[PDB]
């Protein structure tokens, strides 16, 4: 019973890979020979945000590209003003082992979560004048690794119990649950239209979900080690992902196949954070060899290096207007980088 | 600029208040030691933490010894996939690794040895010290004197093993019992001393999971860790 079922699942996989081979006739590198290289990308540290005690593990820009929240493992959720370096908020967390930040697109709420398996939603408008825990979403049995607001009333979270979940802050209940991964789910990225989202897991596979109905659409398997970071391309038709095998990869949803691999022979460290530039031409990747580096998404050659951190780069984020790049690190420092 | 001077002044005052509170929080934070309690469900870890005290993915215990605060964390509702959430504990003072000295379902001592090898050689835990608790010593005492055990067979090199000269047996203890104890301790120290390089240290202890001295063992080992860190900052070690 099980033997024949496995022997037919494997030929389903063979048919899938045959279709993938049929799709792939021209490589993205070959079609991008006609374009010119972006040249060396020189980026300079404009700001350095100090104030966190322990390592910064997550971070998130606001929609106004000015305010940003960051989480530290000492139990602090700090909201900064990147323009003036002033600290706007210093929320203290009930649980010190936070592993994720979200900032509501409206700007009224901030989310956090971690090893306590709880997604805490904090109101920032403070009708009484103080920031308070607006909600505490419970139901995950792993650990919170990522969380992103769909809107003021909805949030999608990634857990170490091998599951993603879309919630409803008003009622505090799991509106829907996304299952199908095998290992820990380490990151999630929302599509620009907020109709789909991708998740990378510890089974070395990325997975695309439709939010409103709640089941897997496509599975991408090109990496050989667990995926640490994932991010959508600006137009929503592709996404990049980094793993511990020291490679970034680009996947196209419509082609449903890996397009390009960003790797170097002298990099043997994992990739912790991934982000795209405003136009998608630059792919910035944070590494745990203490520095970030900037690839170009079309030529697969390094275009720059962001070397200012004394410990591994944990988090990385580009603003909505593409003006600055924030990098966080285990040295407890946050750095803003801009072009010259 | 008349409408923006006031808001900038308000931001500066808010930042000053935040900085004062953060200075207080830093003073509180630097005065406490964070410990990661690690082990198996069949060890005495739960009994040890229950004695120390006298759904959630993390469990917390605050205990004070000699006016020094200790903040011990226990793993709760988590899977057996420790790859990713172990890295959260690279800045703790110590990992208290509890191992049941009894090798039944299978060779659980071998599984604990493999787990200790993984913890020791992890690139993010390579500066974190491990306090080793060779727990359940009474089971060793009343298992090797019962006539037959599963230690001489599951570890073929135990037959050609002699008690170390620097061993300090408890008075009125059979030489077989202390031979087995120090054989397991040396099994852990073989992989502890193979890659130490002076970055971090191991502190083996023979514990019984019910006694008032485990908290003092943790206190003394933490003191040793802090002193060695200070001496390393001065390049005296």
């Amino acid at each position, epitope marked *: 019973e099980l033997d024949q079922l496995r022997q037919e699942a494997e030929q389903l996989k063979n048919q899938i890979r045959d279709a993938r081979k049929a799709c792939a006739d021209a490589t993205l590198s070959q079609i991008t020979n006609n374009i010119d290289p972006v040249g060396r990308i020189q980026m300079r540290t404009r700001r350095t945000l100090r104030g966190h005690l322990a390592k910064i593990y997550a971070m998130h820009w606001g929609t106004d590209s000015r305010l940003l929240v960051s989480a530290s493992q000492d139990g602090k959720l700090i909201i900064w003003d990147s323009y003036t370096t002033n600290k706007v908020h210093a929320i203290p967390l009930r649980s010190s082992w936070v592993m994720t930040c979200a900032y509501a697109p409206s700007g009224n709420y901030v989310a956090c979560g971690g090893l306590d398996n709880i997604c805490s939603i904090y109101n920032l408008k403070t009708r009484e004048g103080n920031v308070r825990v607006s909600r505490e979403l419970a139901g995950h049995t792993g650990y919170l690794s990522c969380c992103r607001f769909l809107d003021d009333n909805q949030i999608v979270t990634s857990s170490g119990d091998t599951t993603c979940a879309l919630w409803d802050i008003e009622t505090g209940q799991q509106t829907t649950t996304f299952t199908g991964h095998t290992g820990d789910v380490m990151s999630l990225s929302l599509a620009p239209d907020t109709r789909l989202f991708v998740s990378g897991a510890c089974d*070395a596979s990325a997975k695309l979900w439709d939010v409103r109905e709640g089941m897997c659409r496509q599975t991408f398997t090109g990496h050989e080690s667990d995926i640490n970071a994932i991010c959508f391309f600006p137009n929503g038709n592709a996404f990049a992902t980094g793993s511990d095998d020291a490679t970034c990869r680009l996947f196209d949803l419509r082609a449903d196949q890996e397009l390009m691999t960003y790797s170097h022979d002298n990099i043997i460290c994992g990739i912790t954070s991934v982000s795209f530039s405003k136009s998608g031409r630059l792919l910035l990747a944070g590494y745990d060899d203490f520095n970030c580096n900037v690839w170009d998404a079309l030529k697969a050659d390094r275009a720059g290096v962001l070397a200012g951190h004394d410990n591994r780069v944990s988090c990385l984020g580009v603003t909505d207007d593409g003006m600055a790049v924030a990098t966080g690190s285990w040295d407890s420092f946050l750095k803003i980088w801009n072009g010259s | 600029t008349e409408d923006q001077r006031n808001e900038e002044k308000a931001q500066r005052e808010a930042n000053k208040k935040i900085e004062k509170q953060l200075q207080k929080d830093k003073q509180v934070y630097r005065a406490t030691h964070r410990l990661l309690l690690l082990g198996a469900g069949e060890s005495g870890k739960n009994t040890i933490v229950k004695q120390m005290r006298i759904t959630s993915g993390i469990f917390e215990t605050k205990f004070q010894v000699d006016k020094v605060n200790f903040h011990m964390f226990d793993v709760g509702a988590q*899977r057996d*996939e420790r790859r990713k959430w172990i890295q959260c504990f690279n800045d703790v003072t110590a990992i208290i690794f509890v191992v049941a000295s009894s090798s039944n379902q299978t*060779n659980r001592l071998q599984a604990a040895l493999k787990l200790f090898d*993984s913890i020791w050689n992890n690139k993010w835990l390579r500066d974190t010290s491990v306090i080793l608790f060779l727990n359940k010593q009474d089971l060793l005492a009343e298992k090797v004197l019962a006539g037959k055990s599963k230690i001489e067979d599951y570890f073929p090199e135990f037959a050609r093993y002699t008690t170390p000269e620097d061993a300090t047996p408890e008075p009125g203890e059979d030489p077989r019992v202390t031979r087995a104890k120090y054989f397991i301790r040396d099994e852990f120290l073989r992989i502890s001393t193979a890659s130490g390089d002076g970055r971090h240290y191991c502190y083996p202890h023979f514990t019984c999971s019910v006694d008032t001295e485990n908290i003092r063992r943790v206190f003394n080992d933490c003191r040793d860790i802090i002193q060695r860190m200070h001496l390393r900052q001065y390049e005296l070690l």
Partner: nanobody, 128 residues
Framework: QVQLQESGGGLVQPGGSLRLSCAASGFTFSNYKMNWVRQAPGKGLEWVSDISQSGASISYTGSVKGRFTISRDNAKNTLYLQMNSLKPEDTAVYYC?????????????????????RGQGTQVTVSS
């Protein structure tokens, strides 16, 4: 796609020799350390032996060392387990398991319930 296929196994008389082979694809064989684990009937997963990137460093569980041997072929991308002089307590499903990450020495997770980089396994039975 990372996958490990185990071949061999079967039923053999006690004291006999039986060979297990492990064919790997979807990753670079050389820069990963690998190992053999097993699950006895009614028991949990236990670690049998491991071999490093280059095959220079080898270790075995105590109840096995002296009997089984392991070797890796990076040219053929294949792991081996020689099981001469078998014993009745060696009946189990054997899994060829891979290290989570390359260029590492700790290599945490192998004998988990739902480990991903692990093969389907082959049943090895000894009886008379």
């Amino acid at each position: 796609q990372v996958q490990l296929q185990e071949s061999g196994g079967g039923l053999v008389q006690p004291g006999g020799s039986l060979r297990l082979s492990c064919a790997a694809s979807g990753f670079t064989f050389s820069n990963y350390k690998m190992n053999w684990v097993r699950q006895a009937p009614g028991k949990g997963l236990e670690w049998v032996s491991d071999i490093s990137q280059s095959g220079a460093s080898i270790s075995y569980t105590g109840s096995v060392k002296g009997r089984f041997t392991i070797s890796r072929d990076n040219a053929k991308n294949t792991l081996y387990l020689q099981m001469n002089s078998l014993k009745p307590e060696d009946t189990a499903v054997y899994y060829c398991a891979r290290c989570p990450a390359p260029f590492t020495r700790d290599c945490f997770d192998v004998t988990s319930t739902t480990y991903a980089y692990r093969g389907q396994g082959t049943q090895v039975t000894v009886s008379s």
